[PDB]
Structure 1
Amino acid sequence: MKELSTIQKREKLNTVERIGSEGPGGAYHEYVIKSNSMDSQGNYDVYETIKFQKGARKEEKSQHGVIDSDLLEIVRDRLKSFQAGPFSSRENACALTHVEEALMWMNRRVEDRIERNVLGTNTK
């Protein structure tokens, strides 16, 4: 099936699906976020598509798109705003630290690929 088996199991607001097939590196590069709610005519209230950068930078015929760290930075900024507001919680605090530490580890991979001169190539 195309639907992602998410960690949240109950009272999910939206459904996330993979679109297409596996591409470079064995990963899908197109995802759909659709709401579980419908309008008055039975169509999705939300139906958004996220297109990832398919093909590394230096490899030819690559297609420009969003990168994974961009999505985490949005989530990082959202959690920081909620923690600064009136509806803060310890759950937000732990999730924020993990998002930032995940963002750091993705930066570590970026810098490591700059040291080995492999950034933007189909290498390990």
Structure 2
Amino acid sequence: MKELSTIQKREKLNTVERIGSEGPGGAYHEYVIKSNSMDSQGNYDVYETIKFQKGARKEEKSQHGVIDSDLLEIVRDRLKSFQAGPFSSRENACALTHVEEALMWMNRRVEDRIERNVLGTNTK
């Protein structure tokens, strides 16, 4: 089925769903973030769709969208702000270090593909 099995199991604010089918690289390129709560009339309090860059950027027929490092950079910024604020935590600091190292590995991939001159194409 469609809903993601999440690491968080208790008191989840939102459900996340993959929409559509597998595409380039074997990945999905549309996701829905959905409130677990509803308003008085049965509507979701939150219903957001995230659409990924589908097909590499230099190939024809490719569809523009967000990329995964965008999401990680937003979360990185949020954790940095929370850590500079009144409600910091050790858990935040550990999560932030892992988020930044993930981003560093994603950039490692980007720079390797620039070097092998395959960035933006469907090549190993």
TM-score by length of 1: 0.99
CA distance in structure 2 between the partners assigned to 1:41 and 1:3 by the alignment = 23
Which of structure 1's runs of 4+ aligned residues deviate more than 3 A? none
Q: How many residues align?
A: 124
CA distance in structure 2 between the partners assigned to 1:41 and 1:113 by the alignment = 50
CA distance in structure 2 between the partners assigned to 1:72 and 1:108 by the alignment = 15
Map of 2:62 onto structure 1: 62
Corresponding residue SS for 1:61: coil
Q: State the 1:65 CA deviation.
A: 0.2
- In the TM superposition, what whole-angstrom CA distance separates every residue of 1:66-113 from its partner, at most 9, and x where no partner exists? 000000000000000000001000000000000000000000000000
TM-score by length of 2: 0.99
Asked if residue 36 in structure 1 is aligned to residue 33 in structure 2, the reply is: no
- In the TM superposition, what whole-angstrom CA distance separates every residue of 1:38-69 from its partner, at most 9, and x where no partner exists? 00100100000000000101110100000000
CA distance in structure 1 between the partners assigned to 2:42 and 2:58 by the alignment = 44
Corresponding residue SS for 2:64: coil
Corresponding residue SS for 2:48: strand
For structure 2, the 5+ residue unaligned runs are none
Corresponding residue SS for 1:98: helix
Corresponding residue SS for 1:87: coil
CA distance in structure 1 between the partners assigned to 2:14 and 2:55 by the alignment = 28
Corresponding residue SS for 2:103: helix
For structure 1, the 5+ residue unaligned runs are none
State the identity %: 100
CA distance in structure 1 between the partners assigned to 2:20 and 2:57 by the alignment = 21
